[PDB]
């Protein structure tokens, strides 16, 4: 049997659940009959990104309609979709193409999860759970519900739950202290930077085996820069509300996972509107999309020398901004060090 604590066992079973992986794919409208979990390959996903990149270019620059039709057929043949009784939409709308780029970001993590699940499991001397936990190469520990660490994090969750996102409540079910192998090391150089903060990152539960084993990562070279609001970086938030939405939970499936990572922001290049950033201005270390609401700068605390913006949602003086909430983007995988993983319970108002 498993040597791991119960909360951690429940966590492993949850991130490796095969049924959740299928639900995710059915939701992206993939045809599970033509495209089973075992058919997914990284090369396949790379080519799909390239196709999306080309079609995105042809829509923007007014390429032939025959070109867009050809690219659409190749995309749907590479990744079989099931639209039921409706006709398949062409990749001729920039919003639809963005939807598809997002689907691929998720398929990248689902592919990692399935590969690990089917890997070296022959060992009979270890419980299946213990075997899959080791595959994550991440030390996971339960944070004592009554310690100072946990108090601060629960304060951060309670105070930063936005006004317009109150279509649900949030209950912190469990807090885990996580330390990915070799991560503290690649992050060392950035401890020299100032403006290091504890920020939020939400994602589907189906992405967590991939996130824990490979860490958070930027979209590959093939992905269009357009598929992302501020370019190809790693996104974070300071309001639990904003990130919580990327968890994709519902009344039917209320438990979500969310990360707190230490991010080396340094001098932020502040923006009020989207900008498909490629080059970062000299002297800048990250991007900060300015929002209408942000935590009260008055209440900001420190946790191991890292700033925690746990203040209550206060309205900032900027009005000429498109964003409702702040967004932080780093363009280097080494600029983040993950710290905690929270198990949240979304209580939907009914
Ligand atoms: N513009 C964003 C796009 C994606 C995410 C995101 C997050 C937080 C703040 C902004 C964005 C997040 O936590 N996960 C995300 O996946």
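Q: What amino acid sequence fits the structure above?
A:
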């Amino acid at each position: 049997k498993s040597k791991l604590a119960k909360p951690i066992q429940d966590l492993i079973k949850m991130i490796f659940d095969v049924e959740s992986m299928k639900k995710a794919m059915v939701e992206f409208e993939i045809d599970l009959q033509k495209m089973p979990l075992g058919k997914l390959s990284k090369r396949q996903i790379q080519s799909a990104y390239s196709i999306l990149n080309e079609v995105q270019q042809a829509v923007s620059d007014g390429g032939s309609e025959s070109q867009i039709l050809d690219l659409s057929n190749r995309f749907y043949t590479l990744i079989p979709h099931d639209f039921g009784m409706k006709k398949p939409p062409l990749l001729s709308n920039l919003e639809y193409i963005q939807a598809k780029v997002q689907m691929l970001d998720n398929l990248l993590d689902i592919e990692v999860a399935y590969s690990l699940l089917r890997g070296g499991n022959e060992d009979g001397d270890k419980d299946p759970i213990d075997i899959n936990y080791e595959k994550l190469r991440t030390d996971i520990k339960v944070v004592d519900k009554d310690s100072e660490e946990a108090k601060i994090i629960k304060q951060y969750v309670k105070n930063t739950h936005a006004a317009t996102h109150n279509a649900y409540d949030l209950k912190v079910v469990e807090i885990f202290r996580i330390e990915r192998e070799g991560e503290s090391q690649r992050y060392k150089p950035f401890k020299q930077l100032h403006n290091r903060q504890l920020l939020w990152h939400g994602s589907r539960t189906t992405n967590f085996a991939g996130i824990l084993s490979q860490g958070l990562r930027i979209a590959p070279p093939e992905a269009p820069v357009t598929g992302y609001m501020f370019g190809k970086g790693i996104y974070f938030a300071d309001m639990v509300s904003k990130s919580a939405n990327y968890c994709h939970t519902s009344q039917a499936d209320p438990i979500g996972l969310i990360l707190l990572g230490e991010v080396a922001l340094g001098n932020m290049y502040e923006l009020k509107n989207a900008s498909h950033i490629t080059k970062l201005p000299k002297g800048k270390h990250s991007v900060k999309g300015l929002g209408k609401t942000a935590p009260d700068p008055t209440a900001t605390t420190t946790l191991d020398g890292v700033e925690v913006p746990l203040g209550n949602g206060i309205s900032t003086g900027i009005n000429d901004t498109c964003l409702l909430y702040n967004e932080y983007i780093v363009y280097d995988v080494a600029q983040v060090n993950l710290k905690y993983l929270l198990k949240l319970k979304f209580n939907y108002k009914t």
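Q: And what stands out in the fold?
A: The longest strand covers residues 168-180.
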